[PDB]
Amino acid sequence: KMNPIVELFIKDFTKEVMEENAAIFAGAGLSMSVGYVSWAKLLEPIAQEIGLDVNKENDLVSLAQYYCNENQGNRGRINQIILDEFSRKVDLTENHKILARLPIHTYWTTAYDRLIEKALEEENKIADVKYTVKQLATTKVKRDAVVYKMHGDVEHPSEAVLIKDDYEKYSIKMDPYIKALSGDLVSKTFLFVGFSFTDPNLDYILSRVRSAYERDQRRHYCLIKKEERRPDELEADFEYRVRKQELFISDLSRFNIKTIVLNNYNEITEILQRIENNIKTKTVFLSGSAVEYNHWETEHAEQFIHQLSKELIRKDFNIVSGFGLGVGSFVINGVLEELYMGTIDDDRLILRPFPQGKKGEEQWDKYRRDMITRTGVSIFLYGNKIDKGQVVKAKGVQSEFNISFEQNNYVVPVGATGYIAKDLWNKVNEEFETYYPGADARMKKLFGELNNEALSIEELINTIIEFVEILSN
Amino acid sequence: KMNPIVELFIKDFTKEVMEENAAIFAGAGLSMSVGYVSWAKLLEPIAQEIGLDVNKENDLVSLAQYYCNENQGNRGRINQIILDEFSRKVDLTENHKILARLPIHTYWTTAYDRLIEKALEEENKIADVKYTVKQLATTKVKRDAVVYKMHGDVEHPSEAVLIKDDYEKYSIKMDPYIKALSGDLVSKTFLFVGFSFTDPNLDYILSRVRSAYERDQRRHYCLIKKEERRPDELEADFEYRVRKQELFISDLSRFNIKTIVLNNYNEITEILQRIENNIKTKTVFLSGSAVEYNHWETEHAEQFIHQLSKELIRKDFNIVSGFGLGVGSFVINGVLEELYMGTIDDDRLILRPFPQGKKGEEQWDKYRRDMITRTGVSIFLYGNKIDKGQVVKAKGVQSEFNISFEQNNYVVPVGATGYIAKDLWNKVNEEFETYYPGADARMKKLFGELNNEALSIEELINTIIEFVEILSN
Ligand SMILES: O=P1(O)OC[C@H]2O[C@@H](O[C@H]3[C@@H](O)[C@H](n4cnc5c4ncn4ccnc54)O[C@@H]3COP(=O)(O)O1)[C@H](O)[C@@H]2O
Ligand SMILES: O=P1(O)OC[C@H]2O[C@@H](O[C@H]3[C@@H](O)[C@H](n4cnc5c4ncn4ccnc54)O[C@@H]3COP(=O)(O)O1)[C@H](O)[C@@H]2O
């Protein structure tokens, strides 16, 4: 768990992303942990050539403009520097991979590198990268996300926005990008990551949006790390910097941009992981097959499964089922009862009955893996089939459990149902920290209660629902 | 009379202009006598601002380029300077007026002022001024001459070729003008006036034409003033400058451009006046009316007039006649005999019979003035009409003589024919210097012989022809 402000932001932004109305605004700071050297370090020889010192300079745009002025406006050196630096092959950080995995269809970047594009490519996602006005007129077919590199690309250094001339001519040359960013800011919920909010173009666009929409501006989010006490600095200077940052954050809130203050930069990764987990765990994989329903009678167990599926649908969960013999019909009935109040939404219930025959069993493993990949939580019930006239614990449920563990999915074996479910519950309780690291007391109590045969249908269903909810929320 | 080289050049260039295959290339030096201050004087504050001295500088293009470099490439100051200087209202010099009066249809100028355009306008000539690539695609209807301002216009200072950047980008931006000038240099006979041949664009174009045509380049002419001994300079430095100028002229001959060395800049005006006189005097106004042909018989005088007109046509003269009673038919017969050897060319014989009646006499004066304006030499014969049955000296011939004198036309009254012609000859001999200033001994002898009644038809005709030829040639 994190700070209550962080928890509220995580809930709100997960809600925004699940509606596919969220955009990510990534600054250069999101790529500073990857391995690219700092822009000030690159400009250090540039500053030394005009007799200045990059460490004593804070406005690097004016520094680059001075360098260009000293060379009759020529940018060849700076173009070569940025091409040499930001085109290097660097391993992607976890933040880029998580952002690629999230269902985010809009990225706006002020960085010249192609880390977002590579992260989207490695997720088998089609990325429509735009850094030219002409490129706005063409859309890639079946694209997953669109990346607006509003400061240019690394492979086109001459069109990168680096000097004051570029910023001054941006409003004329790149006006369609300004219009697109204004439309996104008024129509989408943005998350600013790695952005210092010192960009003149972004200040201009935000001021225009504020002038247009007054107090009815859309709420956006930013992630900013708190000020850290430098070794040379004194306590008074640190407190002054903290107050300055507070005034900065309250003025960004003038643009209806709420700032989340983070202790360190790894909290960005933690927040992204939490959002990804909240999105992924909303889909539950219901597994099991039952000819004999352990201690419970047939009708009682059927009603239990029906009401469990109805509660899962009611709690805004998407059920994926393999249509196991003896369990599939009743989860289908529960979903139908919950939804027919109507049509079957494709997202709420995904049914994947296994092909029957010799041909089907060849691809059964890939079918099972594809079915499980859609989910983030696996729920196992019973696990008994009939082979030679006798009830024998099934083997498909074990494969399903193995696949779920290999995909880092949460496993919720209900031991009260018995058979392979009870075996899996015993296995999980044998090594609880391996499957649920850092579990709370309530989570342990719910997991232990999952193997209670004295619970009624309602009590067991409520225990399962609460366990799945604390896993997801 | 001038130097034999100058006389040969005058003959050849008059021949070229009369064929309407001659072009004029005017440099800035042609406008330096009008009143515009020198370009070095304008750049003197410009040179002082960058710490240089315009007097110590010879390449003013590099000086302007240095000034622009010191101001981040801005040309506003130089544009304002040229607009303020070369757009002033200055009275046209005689050279521009003479060039406008000449039948020259092509001007190429490196000057930004509009003196050529104003000179063409004041002659009621339509001038098609071109200084933009687009303007080459449109032609003025019924234009008399086309002016290519290849270095830009004064009213568009930002497009003037002044700095090294303009010269370096001229070959790309103004390539159609380069092609047009190459075509004119290979298809027309140029006269370079006021041009120092230190222009990089002209050097490039001439080098390209030379590379294309080897020793078969078309001959062109230039007018260059000889070096003058400066008061501070010594004899050795003056001789060195003379030798340097001689080497400069031979190099120009490398481009098949023959240079006429002039003692002073007024010799340009003298040469232009001589060419204009040679062109204008080739048209002779034949005047007269005769009922009684003085001492000669009717048939003898008719044969004399016929052979005189035949000789005038044979000597490449264009006859303009008013179709006077008793003279017009026989000059017409002479022209027909000379030409039918065939059709009547409109230039060789212009016939302007006077309208008969009260309506005609109202416009008779303007008709006579328009008829005489086409000519440069007036020849008067006889001048006797019949009013009340008696031979009375005519009055139209006197008006024709007055109009010819008012237009500065040469008058050749033949006193042997008598009547108004004899009266006019006596009047001219009364004040010979007024009508023929600076006349030679041969001219005086011919004028005196013009009033000899002892001459035969052939002798009198030869005297008239020789007098008219020494007037023209
Ligand atoms: O029980 P298990 O071991 O694992 C159970 C899991 O598997 C999947 O459902 C089973 C099974 O109910 C279904 N099935 C239905 N009818 C027959 C049949 N399979 C073989 N038959 C021979 C004759 N009639 C049948 O075929 C799936 C594959 O077979 P297994 O994976 O071996 O089944 C679910 O997702 C369930 O979670
Ligand atoms: O002789 P002049 O004084 O001057 C002579 C000069 O003039 C022009 O030719 C005269 C004249 O030959 C012609 N003309 C012909 N027939 C008649 C007549 N004019 C009056 N008529 C009344 C009855 N029939 C006539 O009308 C031109 C105008 O009359 P004027 O100028 O008075 O003639 C030439 O260019 C000639 O050089």
mmCIF file with all atom_site columns, C-alpha atoms in Angstrom, chain A residues 217-284:
data_model
loop_
_atom_site.group_PDB
_atom_site.id
_atom_site.type_symbol
_atom_site.label_atom_id
_atom_site.label_alt_id
_atom_site.label_comp_id
_atom_site.label_asym_id
_atom_site.label_entity_id
_atom_site.label_seq_id
_atom_site.pdbx_PDB_ins_code
_atom_site.Cartn_x
_atom_site.Cartn_y
_atom_site.Cartn_z
_atom_site.occupancy
_atom_site.B_iso_or_equiv
_atom_site.pdbx_formal_charge
_atom_site.auth_seq_id
_atom_site.auth_comp_id
_atom_site.auth_asym_id
_atom_site.auth_atom_id
_atom_site.pdbx_PDB_model_num
ATOM 1  C CA . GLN A 1 217 ? -10.935 22.555  -17.418 1.00 0.00 ? 217 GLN A CA 1
ATOM 2  C CA . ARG A 1 218 ? -10.574 18.786  -17.459 1.00 0.00 ? 218 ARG A CA 1
ATOM 3  C CA . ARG A 1 219 ? -8.575  17.335  -14.595 1.00 0.00 ? 219 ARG A CA 1
ATOM 4  C CA . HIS A 1 220 ? -5.209  15.962  -15.383 1.00 0.00 ? 220 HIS A CA 1
ATOM 5  C CA . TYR A 1 221 ? -2.508  14.292  -13.311 1.00 0.00 ? 221 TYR A CA 1
ATOM 6  C CA . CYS A 1 222 ? 1.235   14.768  -12.975 1.00 0.00 ? 222 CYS A CA 1
ATOM 7  C CA . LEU A 1 223 ? 3.875   12.793  -11.074 1.00 0.00 ? 223 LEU A CA 1
ATOM 8  C CA . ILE A 1 224 ? 6.603   14.916  -9.469  1.00 0.00 ? 224 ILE A CA 1
ATOM 9  C CA . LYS A 1 225 ? 9.351   13.802  -7.097  1.00 0.00 ? 225 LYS A CA 1
ATOM 10 C CA . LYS A 1 226 ? 9.816   15.810  -3.915  1.00 0.00 ? 226 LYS A CA 1
ATOM 11 C CA . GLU A 1 227 ? 12.918  17.918  -3.367  1.00 0.00 ? 227 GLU A CA 1
ATOM 12 C CA . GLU A 1 228 ? 15.888  16.111  -1.820  1.00 0.00 ? 228 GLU A CA 1
ATOM 13 C CA . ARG A 1 229 ? 18.471  17.710  0.465   1.00 0.00 ? 229 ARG A CA 1
ATOM 14 C CA . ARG A 1 230 ? 21.708  18.061  -1.480  1.00 0.00 ? 230 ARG A CA 1
ATOM 15 C CA . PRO A 1 231 ? 24.907  17.246  0.456   1.00 0.00 ? 231 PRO A CA 1
ATOM 16 C CA . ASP A 1 232 ? 26.297  20.771  0.057   1.00 0.00 ? 232 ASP A CA 1
ATOM 17 C CA . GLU A 1 233 ? 23.003  22.530  0.807   1.00 0.00 ? 233 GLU A CA 1
ATOM 18 C CA . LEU A 1 234 ? 21.913  23.732  4.239   1.00 0.00 ? 234 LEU A CA 1
ATOM 19 C CA . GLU A 1 235 ? 18.578  23.141  5.952   1.00 0.00 ? 235 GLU A CA 1
ATOM 20 C CA . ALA A 1 236 ? 17.306  26.639  5.126   1.00 0.00 ? 236 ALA A CA 1
ATOM 21 C CA . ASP A 1 237 ? 18.056  26.237  1.412   1.00 0.00 ? 237 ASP A CA 1
ATOM 22 C CA . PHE A 1 238 ? 16.334  22.843  1.397   1.00 0.00 ? 238 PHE A CA 1
ATOM 23 C CA . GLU A 1 239 ? 13.239  24.308  3.067   1.00 0.00 ? 239 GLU A CA 1
ATOM 24 C CA . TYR A 1 240 ? 13.255  27.181  0.568   1.00 0.00 ? 240 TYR A CA 1
ATOM 25 C CA . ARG A 1 241 ? 13.401  24.679  -2.304  1.00 0.00 ? 241 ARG A CA 1
ATOM 26 C CA . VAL A 1 242 ? 10.531  22.699  -0.761  1.00 0.00 ? 242 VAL A CA 1
ATOM 27 C CA . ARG A 1 243 ? 8.420   25.861  -0.486  1.00 0.00 ? 243 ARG A CA 1
ATOM 28 C CA . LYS A 1 244 ? 9.311   26.796  -4.070  1.00 0.00 ? 244 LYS A CA 1
ATOM 29 C CA . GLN A 1 245 ? 8.193   23.355  -5.252  1.00 0.00 ? 245 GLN A CA 1
ATOM 30 C CA . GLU A 1 246 ? 4.936   23.693  -3.301  1.00 0.00 ? 246 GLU A CA 1
ATOM 31 C CA . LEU A 1 247 ? 4.244   27.031  -5.000  1.00 0.00 ? 247 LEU A CA 1
ATOM 32 C CA . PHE A 1 248 ? 5.100   25.407  -8.339  1.00 0.00 ? 248 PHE A CA 1
ATOM 33 C CA . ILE A 1 249 ? 2.626   22.586  -7.716  1.00 0.00 ? 249 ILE A CA 1
ATOM 34 C CA . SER A 1 250 ? -0.149  24.894  -6.717  1.00 0.00 ? 250 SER A CA 1
ATOM 35 C CA . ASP A 1 251 ? 0.280   26.866  -9.855  1.00 0.00 ? 251 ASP A CA 1
ATOM 36 C CA . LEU A 1 252 ? 0.071   23.854  -11.969 1.00 0.00 ? 252 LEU A CA 1
ATOM 37 C CA . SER A 1 253 ? -3.047  23.189  -10.156 1.00 0.00 ? 253 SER A CA 1
ATOM 38 C CA . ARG A 1 254 ? -4.159  26.514  -11.813 1.00 0.00 ? 254 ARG A CA 1
ATOM 39 C CA . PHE A 1 255 ? -4.350  24.549  -14.863 1.00 0.00 ? 255 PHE A CA 1
ATOM 40 C CA . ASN A 1 256 ? -6.435  21.865  -13.080 1.00 0.00 ? 256 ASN A CA 1
ATOM 41 C CA . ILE A 1 257 ? -3.408  19.535  -13.066 1.00 0.00 ? 257 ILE A CA 1
ATOM 42 C CA . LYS A 1 258 ? -3.203  17.643  -9.771  1.00 0.00 ? 258 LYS A CA 1
ATOM 43 C CA . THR A 1 259 ? 0.344   16.722  -8.758  1.00 0.00 ? 259 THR A CA 1
ATOM 44 C CA . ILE A 1 260 ? 1.268   13.494  -6.969  1.00 0.00 ? 260 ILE A CA 1
ATOM 45 C CA . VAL A 1 261 ? 4.419   14.029  -4.912  1.00 0.00 ? 261 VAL A CA 1
ATOM 46 C CA . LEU A 1 262 ? 6.652   10.948  -4.884  1.00 0.00 ? 262 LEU A CA 1
ATOM 47 C CA . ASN A 1 263 ? 9.540   10.167  -2.550  1.00 0.00 ? 263 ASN A CA 1
ATOM 48 C CA . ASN A 1 264 ? 11.656  8.657   -5.341  1.00 0.00 ? 264 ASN A CA 1
ATOM 49 C CA . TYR A 1 265 ? 11.480  7.784   -9.029  1.00 0.00 ? 265 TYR A CA 1
ATOM 50 C CA . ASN A 1 266 ? 10.818  4.082   -8.390  1.00 0.00 ? 266 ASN A CA 1
ATOM 51 C CA . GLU A 1 267 ? 7.380   5.076   -7.091  1.00 0.00 ? 267 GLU A CA 1
ATOM 52 C CA . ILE A 1 268 ? 6.515   5.848   -10.719 1.00 0.00 ? 268 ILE A CA 1
ATOM 53 C CA . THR A 1 269 ? 7.173   2.181   -11.491 1.00 0.00 ? 269 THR A CA 1
ATOM 54 C CA . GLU A 1 270 ? 5.205   1.124   -8.408  1.00 0.00 ? 270 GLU A CA 1
ATOM 55 C CA . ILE A 1 271 ? 2.201   3.251   -9.432  1.00 0.00 ? 271 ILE A CA 1
ATOM 56 C CA . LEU A 1 272 ? 2.329   1.942   -13.000 1.00 0.00 ? 272 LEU A CA 1
ATOM 57 C CA . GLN A 1 273 ? 2.514   -1.644  -11.728 1.00 0.00 ? 273 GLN A CA 1
ATOM 58 C CA . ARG A 1 274 ? -0.460  -1.016  -9.437  1.00 0.00 ? 274 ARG A CA 1
ATOM 59 C CA . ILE A 1 275 ? -2.532  0.418   -12.296 1.00 0.00 ? 275 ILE A CA 1
ATOM 60 C CA . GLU A 1 276 ? -1.563  -2.506  -14.535 1.00 0.00 ? 276 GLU A CA 1
ATOM 61 C CA . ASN A 1 277 ? -2.519  -4.974  -11.800 1.00 0.00 ? 277 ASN A CA 1
ATOM 62 C CA . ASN A 1 278 ? -5.868  -3.252  -11.225 1.00 0.00 ? 278 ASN A CA 1
ATOM 63 C CA . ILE A 1 279 ? -6.622  -3.428  -14.953 1.00 0.00 ? 279 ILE A CA 1
ATOM 64 C CA . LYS A 1 280 ? -5.425  -7.023  -15.365 1.00 0.00 ? 280 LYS A CA 1
ATOM 65 C CA . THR A 1 281 ? -7.064  -8.576  -12.290 1.00 0.00 ? 281 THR A CA 1
ATOM 66 C CA . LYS A 1 282 ? -10.538 -7.367  -13.310 1.00 0.00 ? 282 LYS A CA 1
ATOM 67 C CA . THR A 1 283 ? -10.710 -10.443 -15.579 1.00 0.00 ? 283 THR A CA 1
ATOM 68 C CA . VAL A 1 284 ? -11.117 -13.698 -13.638 1.00 0.00 ? 284 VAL A CA 1
#
